[PDB]
């Protein structure tokens, strides 16, 4: 997928994976991937949250970014995911009021 969020079972982008294509407001139980990437490429930008409905801790990933060891990031378990857009200016508007 060109825009999707990639969630890998193992660290450093190994093992089985899941592709996510759009925002999802609750994942139960929470998803605990080893690593997460967004493909290189407007530009997709993804927010991962440790609570449902786009609340809680927030880890964001722009296009071409991998988190190689997601277990060592801000939180281990993803409860919701928001798909956004990063504008040519570099800003992401999807969580703004």
TrEMBL record:
Superkingdom in the source lineage: Eukaryota
Keywords assigned by UniProt, alphabetized: Signal
Record domain Interleukin-4 inducing immunoglobulin-binding: where: 4-86
Disulfide bridge partners, by residue number: 1-4, 37-66, 84-94
Protein name from the UniProt record: IL-4-inducing protein
UniProt source species: Schistosoma mansoni
